[PDB]
Point group: D3
Chain length 248, copies 6
């Protein structure tokens, strides 16, 4: 893949979105690829942390759109697959939010264990109501969990962003680096520099044991959300509203 | 009913408490009526949102109190009935908090999906400990969910209000309109004006699909809370403490 | 026990850590004793509230460390026993945080229903990753519940404190008394003075009824966390990492 | 109570229905009394087994029937109370079926851990459909559990007995003593004689440990059945059908 | 529909398979139609029982088989739809087994509340292993429930029939009419004649109340089985094994 | 291991107890070894069925018994380990019962998916009450599931065998080969001969898909039983009763 790279640095398996010119819009095969990198990280016994980093001004603008139009099966398969990979991952998922994330890629940011922001202009947008669709990527559970149920209805029902202030107010962001949006690259490096200091001394397998115990609180609910979100959407696709809306 | 009106405006089924002289105190039949308006809204295929609006300085002061005194069966039936109607409603419930809500009507404000406040003097009071009673209207689940479990014990155990600051700190309020308490009517209009702009463009059935998926996270827990709250209270009624306290 | 006292004052069963010289470090038998005081409080029909108070500058520095080294069975038995006593207690648990709590005693502070702080220097530290161990004392459930899941991963994975600001931001603390750390004794008295005013008027059995309904939301999850935390740790003990680390 | 006696013989707390002239029909206070004997047995640390024995040709013909007619609250309270006592009992419940059981007393026979029959004419009848009522005494769970779900619908829907053949076919009866119905007294003695031989040698607290682990499989489902059976019946009582039918 | 008729006789909504020449093989639209008859029966407030009757020597031989071959979506939609209709039906489902049932129609016989057999040659066959498929029509739950888990593995793993003896041994059949297979018509009439006698006297809404309480024991498990059976099969379809096998 | 062999024959991974002189009594390391053979079978993508075969007149007489006596930790570790391996195994487990099984090895026979008996003298004995112990090897769930809850209390409470008649009455045995106990070897061969015929034609991965869906009905309950059985036993070991009894 040309749009996504990865490397391993000690106990950190680093994944990087490197298509800043297209706002790291991602296609179905890019979400499959992302899911296969998480499988590589999950099987590497040296890796303890999987860091998701991007580039440019946006973290990701979400799904890139260009009865064979029954092409929506490959769209739903790709969503379920990469959502499932984020849900079951056993290594510590850390998102470096270098800017806004929209759609499915905003959903994956909400499934990460720890999130860091470049600055206070980041936001998460879930435009399901404007696309004639419903929750996806496990957001049925992840948004009420991490932002509270009333805030969640305000954002989702009226297609409004989860902004920085709301993020800080719910503790979704562990640390804001307060750095210019023109350099994601320095933000990417300074997070890894800070991660290298905080793991010194620690017994890393302990991080994995805690995560495993922590993930069991909601693992059923996340897995069921992945399934009922798909099921419930089929009828939106059969009606055809998403198909108009997905064109302007 | 003279104390409660309703009208439909496009996709908004609007319910309005219009007894500002008695602080919109409500009797058992007023809670039944409220429950029957939610059934009318829930069956109207044009309605997508049910807005609960009040009048005057208070949203509601709660239950209006004036072996035939086994009149507590009609009090518990009315609580279960209207709590159940709020729990199962499939349209987006939006509360316009024009002032304080106390008791059962404070419980229904906590069951709404979205809440807006007129100003920073609003509060929610659950005086169960001062009435020799226990949680009701599904507050066993709704308060820890939307305010956090420690805050919940502080308010409930010592009969203390959930004030505006606590509300904003937990994101219970989506927007404070910062308007004088002498005009609920202008606050009621400006919320509907803002709701008319935010639904433009959206696919409304999408709002319902998300809600249905969202409500399933806690539907069992809310339904069981409605039942065990009643069960567990019976013995408080059999002792007689509420009966003294319900008189001064 | 010389390090822990208790007394009863009306409806308040008061437990007090009185070993400020050793930062109220506690041994296995001190955690057993704590668990037996909660059984005495839980069976006293006059008691409605169990207040946990300490002394000096620290609330508690946690476990005091000085194939017979299979002495870890008595360490795991003591943790399960006192965690279980906090989990099932039916009286209102109120912690007077007079300073930092670390380890197992930080875990018990997170199981209390209501927490008050002496001042803004208090913190909670869970150094499991630095000891080659995993979550304990029901923290698998209590930390994500009361601080949110992302904040929880940041603190636990990197051995970082849950500080005052994070505490206030999640509403973990009901009231900060803003008093010097040199006098826990005046902080202990002023909390009890304020508790004596807030219970006046109330029907105390109502406090117990609400708690019982409130505790049922998570009782299964807390009991299972107590068990799987032990189970999952055994292999950390069998490896031997904790044994080195527990020495410097 | 004149209709019910009890005695203790080593580790056996023996309860005996001794009103053969009225077919051991039982009134509300007799079901309360039965429930209080199970509390005495449950608290006696010497008792390991609670044997329920009757007299005459019937084990029990069920409830004995002779807005004050809101006397149905004391009928529902008595059912919930004695059902709950059978559900939570921690000692081995053994029923000596000396003949047919009908109604609520047939429900309690289905909640016993072990059942012995005098002869092949015993039967269990649940006439809920002929009384304009619904399942009670936890039969919603106990009948499908111990007789299978299709057999259960055939018996309940059409008011038909669970006969001996059906009982043996599902293993509801551990042993048929094949003795005449004219002597329950010899059947009562020969069961106790056989119980005295089978406990010799055994570690009795082991019987209690197994039961505790065994009861946890369905304890939630039994407790919820006790509650939803009552809830769901209220509307049958409010209609009035049971009231006619309860008279001929 | 030419292959399926229905009529209403007092409280019995009678559905009849009338294509004995093709062994009542059913196509996708015939399963949809069956599902729509259950919706008509479920909404008719006069109906209390829905009787499923067939004709000829077989109850049904199952699915009738004659990238457009992505025709398997309409095959999976039809299975989920009619399985769901049987799962949620609120009226008493009674199957008149006039002979063998195979496949999806054998699955629907296992979802009926009560089953009657014409004679001892009836059998139920689930040939999933011989078709390169997996459980369907909720058989994941219904077979272990009504036949026991070991018997279930023997039949399913090796493509072997659930025969009459196994049926009687688990109480799946309420009554065998012992009548020749050459006249389903007289068997159909004699069941309805016997149903007309057994409902006399009873309070029919009581049948519905019991069913509602009874169905709640497993409703979650049946609904989840309907979903995970589909999900898990997709990959069998993507491999292509069913497609060969579905041809000979 | 000298007492246990294994071989692979097409899709059958065959495990064989070959110590007929000691009635295939098994030690802790033999249960570990059994657990490691199930891991080898579970990872072999060619294997679809794991057949457990024994030798001589007994299938197995159970645990072979010959503060270092804190040797009970290695006894509880071995039980949990091999129980867990049987619980999670994904290949079809088939037990060839060549005679009686007692203790932990009787527990593993109850965890097999399919059971065949040599003749009608086989039995399963769970002597927990005679050893001052409680249920183990997941029998808390497996016995009530496969034999019914009343039968289960009769056998367990009074230390009585689950005999052949009870086995056939609950369908625990798929087929009795009716062969002399002097030749387990011919019974072992004739089962494999019959297994080779029944798999011909079938799509074997289908067997695995069904099993996976089937095992999910009770997987939580089996895993929790494995844990709470151990937990609850510790106090029986701390008392010391098992230690006397384990000697005569």
């Amino acid at each position: 893949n040309e749009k996504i790279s990865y490397r391993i640095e000690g106990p950190f398996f680093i994944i990087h979105l490197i298509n800043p010119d297209n706002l790291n819009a991602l296609e179905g095969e890019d979400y499959i690829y992302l899911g296969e990198l998480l499988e590589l990280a999950d099987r590497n016994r040296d890796v303890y942390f999987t860091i998701i980093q991007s580039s440019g001004r946006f973290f990701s603008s979400g799904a890139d759109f260009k009865e064979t139009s029954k092409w929506v099966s490959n769209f739903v398969a790709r969503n379920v697959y990469v959502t499932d990979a984020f849900i079951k991952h056993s290594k510590v998922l850390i998102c470096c939010l270098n800017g806004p994330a929209i759609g499915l890629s905003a959903a994956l940011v909400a499934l990460c264990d720890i999130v860091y922001s470049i600055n206070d202009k980041v936001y998460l947008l879930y435009p399901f109501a404007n696309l004639g669709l419903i929750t996806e990527g496990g957001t049925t559970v992840s948004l009420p969990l991490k932002f509270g149920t009333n805030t969640t209805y305000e954002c989702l029902m009226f297609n409004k962003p989860f902004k920085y202030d709301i993020m800080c107010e719910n503790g979704f962001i562990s640390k804001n680096f307060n750095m210019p949006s023109s350099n994601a690259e320095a933000f990417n490096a300074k997070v890894l520099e800070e991660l290298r200091e905080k793991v010194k001394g620690l017994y890393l397998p302990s991080c994995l044991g805690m995560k495993k115990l922590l993930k069991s609180n909601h693992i059923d609910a996340f897995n069921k959300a992945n399934s009922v979100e798909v099921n419930e959407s089929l009828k939106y696709w059969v009606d055809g509203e998403p198909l108009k809306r997905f064109r302007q």
